[model samples]
Target: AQRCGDQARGAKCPNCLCCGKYGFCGSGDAYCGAGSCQSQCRGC
Candidate 1:
């Protein structure tokens, strides 16, 4: 379990964005496709 911190700027997670820095969840593309996607993201 990790900390997603403030959802989106000043909101909760799993609502606006499943992740903090990035919104939504998925595999490949802009999601886990590349880069160091935070494990703390809302839904890991």
Candidate 2:
């Protein structure tokens, strides 16, 4: 998608890969989506 999480700066990703950095938003407490991985909360 676009982006996600805090680093995304309001950019919500449908399937991000940066966890807390660019993780998928509005998914749940999970944050990321569609097998997303990241540097912070990454690894899905």
Give the top-scoring candidate (TM-score).
1
Clashes of each: 0, 1
Candidate 1 wrong stretches, greater than 4 Å: 1-5, 8-20, 40-44
Native-to-model Cα distance after best TM-score fit, residue 31 in candidate 2, in Å: 8.8
lDDT of 1 by residue, 1-44 (tens): 12343443443445322342443344333454336455434333
**TM-score of each model, in listed order:** 0.25, 0.24
TM-score of 1: 0.25
- Model 2 stretches with alpha carbons more than 4 Å out: 1-3, 15-44
Per-prediction RMSD in angstroms? 7.2, 8.0
Specify the poorest-scoring 10-residue window by lDDT in model 2: 13-22
Residue lDDT tens for model 2, 1-44 = 34455656655443323344444433344544435544334333
